[PDB]
Design an enzyme around this catalytic site. Structure first.
Site, PDB file in Angstrom:
ATOM      1  N   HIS A   1       0.859  -1.115   0.109  1.00  0.00           N
ATOM      2  CA  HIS A   1      -0.118  -0.188  -0.697  1.00  0.00           C
ATOM      3  C   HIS A   1       0.853   1.797  -0.524  1.00  0.00           C
ATOM      4  O   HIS A   1       2.416   1.090   0.067  1.00  0.00           O
ATOM      5  CB  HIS A   1      -1.197   0.006   1.129  1.00  0.00           C
ATOM      6  CG  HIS A   1      -0.490  -0.090   2.856  1.00  0.00           C
ATOM      7  ND1 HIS A   1      -0.364  -0.837   3.437  1.00  0.00           N
ATOM      8  CD2 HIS A   1      -0.610   1.033   3.074  1.00  0.00           C
ATOM      9  CE1 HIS A   1      -0.102  -0.710   4.481  1.00  0.00           C
ATOM     10  NE2 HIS A   1      -0.095   0.456   4.645  1.00  0.00           N
TER      11      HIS A   1
ATOM     12  N   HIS B   1       1.410   3.889   2.217  1.00  0.00           N
ATOM     13  CA  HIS B   1       2.144   4.575   3.317  1.00  0.00           C
ATOM     14  C   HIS B   1       3.719   4.577   3.313  1.00  0.00           C
ATOM     15  O   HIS B   1       4.566   3.396   2.630  1.00  0.00           O
ATOM     16  CB  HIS B   1       1.894   3.749   4.303  1.00  0.00           C
ATOM     17  CG  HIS B   1      -0.222   4.995   4.526  1.00  0.00           C
ATOM     18  ND1 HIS B   1      -0.692   3.599   5.611  1.00  0.00           N
ATOM     19  CD2 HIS B   1      -0.425   5.936   4.585  1.00  0.00           C
ATOM     20  CE1 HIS B   1      -2.046   4.311   5.444  1.00  0.00           C
ATOM     21  NE2 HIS B   1      -1.797   5.378   4.660  1.00  0.00           N
TER      22      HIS B   1
ATOM     23  N   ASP C   1       5.606   3.111   5.703  1.00  0.00           N
ATOM     24  CA  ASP C   1       6.494   2.088   5.916  1.00  0.00           C
ATOM     25  C   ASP C   1       6.280   0.956   4.792  1.00  0.00           C
ATOM     26  O   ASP C   1       6.809  -0.633   4.746  1.00  0.00           O
ATOM     27  CB  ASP C   1       5.292   1.043   7.266  1.00  0.00           C
ATOM     28  CG  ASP C   1       4.533   0.311   7.087  1.00  0.00           C
ATOM     29  OD1 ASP C   1       3.680   1.181   6.022  1.00  0.00           O
ATOM     30  OD2 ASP C   1       3.565  -0.014   7.787  1.00  0.00           O
TER      31      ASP C   1
ATOM     32  N   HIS D   1      -6.925  -1.899   5.388  1.00  0.00           N
ATOM     33  CA  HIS D   1      -6.207  -0.692   6.450  1.00  0.00           C
ATOM     34  C   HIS D   1      -6.326   0.839   5.572  1.00  0.00           C
ATOM     35  O   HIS D   1      -6.042   1.877   5.936  1.00  0.00           O
ATOM     36  CB  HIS D   1      -5.338  -1.772   7.002  1.00  0.00           C
ATOM     37  CG  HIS D   1      -4.052  -0.367   7.302  1.00  0.00           C
ATOM     38  ND1 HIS D   1      -3.578   0.277   8.009  1.00  0.00           N
ATOM     39  CD2 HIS D   1      -2.610   0.500   6.094  1.00  0.00           C
ATOM     40  CE1 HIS D   1      -2.718   0.680   7.540  1.00  0.00           C
ATOM     41  NE2 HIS D   1      -2.402   1.149   7.690  1.00  0.00           N
TER      42      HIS D   1
ATOM     43  N   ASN E   1      -3.545   4.036  15.079  1.00  0.00           N
ATOM     44  CA  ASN E   1      -4.476   5.025  13.809  1.00  0.00           C
ATOM     45  C   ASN E   1      -4.428   3.901  12.315  1.00  0.00           C
ATOM     46  O   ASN E   1      -3.735   3.438  11.442  1.00  0.00           O
ATOM     47  CB  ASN E   1      -2.752   5.549  13.733  1.00  0.00           C
ATOM     48  CG  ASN E   1      -3.005   6.797  11.865  1.00  0.00           C
ATOM     49  OD1 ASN E   1      -2.847   6.250  11.578  1.00  0.00           O
ATOM     50  ND2 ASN E   1      -3.242   8.256  12.065  1.00  0.00           N
TER      51      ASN E   1
HETATM   52  O1  LIG Z   1       3.871   1.319  11.291  1.00  0.00           O
HETATM   53  C1  LIG Z   1       3.019   1.671  11.660  1.00  0.00           C
HETATM   54  N1  LIG Z   1       1.728   2.610  11.022  1.00  0.00           N
HETATM   55  C2  LIG Z   1       2.588   2.810   9.679  1.00  0.00           C
HETATM   56  C3  LIG Z   1       2.756   4.732   9.553  1.00  0.00           C
HETATM   57  C4  LIG Z   1       2.503   4.821  10.371  1.00  0.00           C
HETATM   58  C5  LIG Z   1       2.647   6.315  10.617  1.00  0.00           C
HETATM   59  C6  LIG Z   1       3.010   6.839   9.115  1.00  0.00           C
HETATM   60  C7  LIG Z   1       3.282   6.231   7.924  1.00  0.00           C
HETATM   61  C8  LIG Z   1       3.342   4.620   7.846  1.00  0.00           C
HETATM   62  O2  LIG Z   1       3.323   3.811   7.404  1.00  0.00           O
HETATM   63  P1  LIG Z   1       0.753   2.105   9.351  1.00  0.00           P
HETATM   64  O3  LIG Z   1       0.266   2.676   9.349  1.00  0.00           O
HETATM   65  O4  LIG Z   1       1.272   0.555   9.294  1.00  0.00           O
HETATM   66  O5  LIG Z   1       1.249   2.629   7.578  1.00  0.00           O
HETATM   67  C9  LIG Z   1       2.379   0.862  12.930  1.00  0.00           C
HETATM   68  C10 LIG Z   1       3.135  -0.270  14.132  1.00  0.00           C
HETATM   69  C11 LIG Z   1       2.327  -0.645  15.374  1.00  0.00           C
HETATM   70  C12 LIG Z   1       3.146  -1.653  15.832  1.00  0.00           C
HETATM   71  C13 LIG Z   1       3.418  -2.208  16.979  1.00  0.00           C
HETATM   72  C14 LIG Z   1       1.967  -1.169  17.248  1.00  0.00           C
HETATM   73  C15 LIG Z   1       2.008  -0.206  16.817  1.00  0.00           C
HETATM   74  C16 LIG Z   1       1.779   0.564  15.506  1.00  0.00           C
HETATM   75  S1  LIG Z   1       1.643   1.224  14.901  1.00  0.00           S
HETATM   76 ZN   LIG Z   2      -0.650   2.104   6.661  1.00  0.00          ZN
HETATM   77 ZN   LIG Z   3       2.109  -0.852   8.673  1.00  0.00          ZN
END
Ligand SMILES: O=C(N[C@H](c1ccccc1O)P(=O)(O)O)c1cc2ccccc2s1
Ligand SMILES: [Zn+2]
Ligand SMILES: [Zn+2]
Ligand SMILES: [Zn+2]
Length: 231
Positions: free
Chosen positions: A83, A85, A87, A148, A179
């Site tokens: 996706h 984002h 990460d 997600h 989030n």
């Molecule tokens: O990496 C996480 N958020 C991803 C994200 C956040 C902010 C900006 C970009 C982004 O890609 P995401 O929402 O997955 O895209 C999270 C991982 C974990 C692991 C354990 C507990 C809470 C969390 S929060």
């Molecule tokens: Zn994400």
């Molecule tokens: Zn993620």
């Protein structure tokens, strides 16, 4: 045996062999003062490797490529981001500079551009409607529907019965949504049921963050999502 958040010095990348020719990659991002783990996947295809997702950032993704060369020694020729984002796509420019062909759905590429994130080069066709699947080298890519994020893909390795859910699937230890700013909460349980329907034989299920388990991770995620919906 699976590496946890505390066991990986920040900035490093670990590889975990799940089955013959299938690894996860595990990295960390210390953001807003806390430390988070993140998973991607590596799948052997003959004498080359397919990478699923970056390691959340340019430096982490450079370390990922270095660890792959050190431990596996086969070239990463293609990468798929599941996706839009950071990460999943943060590190796409590092992959591109290293000669890896980068891919995502056209929906993911557009959303990444709108977000100002890095944009995979190639567009994956055949994934625009919920329930669509396509083969991509040694994996099947599946669009289960919005969850997600509206564009999230999942990845199945048929030779190893490994299902990589990405951030649409939560690990068991995560009991709150956190989030979900770009999520479709209303569709997420239905999208999870499409995953179950399509991959009922999966033996390993890898969440986007944290510990693998079995198919139980799907109903756990639906429980978390519905509880958040009723928050
Ligand atoms: O990496 C996480 N958020 C991803 C994200 C956040 C902010 C900006 C970009 C982004 O890609 P995401 O929402 O997955 O895209 C999270 C991982 C974990 C692991 C354990 C507990 C809470 C969390 S929060
Ligand atoms: Zn994400
Ligand atoms: Zn993620
Ligand atoms: Zn190309």
């Amino acid at each position: 045996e699976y590496p946890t958040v505390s066991e990986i010095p920040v900035g490093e990348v670990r590889l975990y062999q799940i089955a013959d020719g299938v690894w996860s990659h595990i990295a960390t991002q210390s953001f807003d003062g806390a430390v988070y783990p993140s998973n991607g996947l590596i799948v052997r295809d003959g004498d080359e490797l397919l990478l699923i997702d970056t390691a959340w950032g340019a430096k982490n993704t450079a370390a990922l490529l270095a660890e792959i060369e050190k431990q596996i020694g086969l070239p990463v020729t293609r990468a798929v981001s599941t996706h839009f984002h950071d990460d999943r796509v943060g590190g796409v420019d590092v992959l591109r500079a290293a000669g890896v062909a980068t891919y995502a759905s056209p929906s993911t590429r557009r959303l990444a551009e709108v977000e100002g994130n890095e944009i995979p080069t190639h567009s994956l066709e055949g994934l625009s409607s919920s329930g669509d699947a396509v083969r991509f080298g040694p994996v099947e890519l599946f669009y289960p529907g919005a969850a997600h994020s509206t564009d999230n893909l999942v990845v199945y390795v048929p030779s190893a019965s490994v299902l990589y859910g990405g951030c649409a699937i939560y690990e068991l230890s995560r009991t709150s949504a956190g989030n979900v700013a770009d999520a479709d909460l209303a569709e997420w349980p239905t999208s999870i049921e499409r995953i179950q329907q399509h991959y009922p034989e999966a033996q390993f299920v890898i969440p986007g963050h944290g510990l693998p388990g079995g198919l139980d991770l799907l109903k756990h995620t639906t429980n978390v999502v519905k509880a958040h919906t009723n928050r």
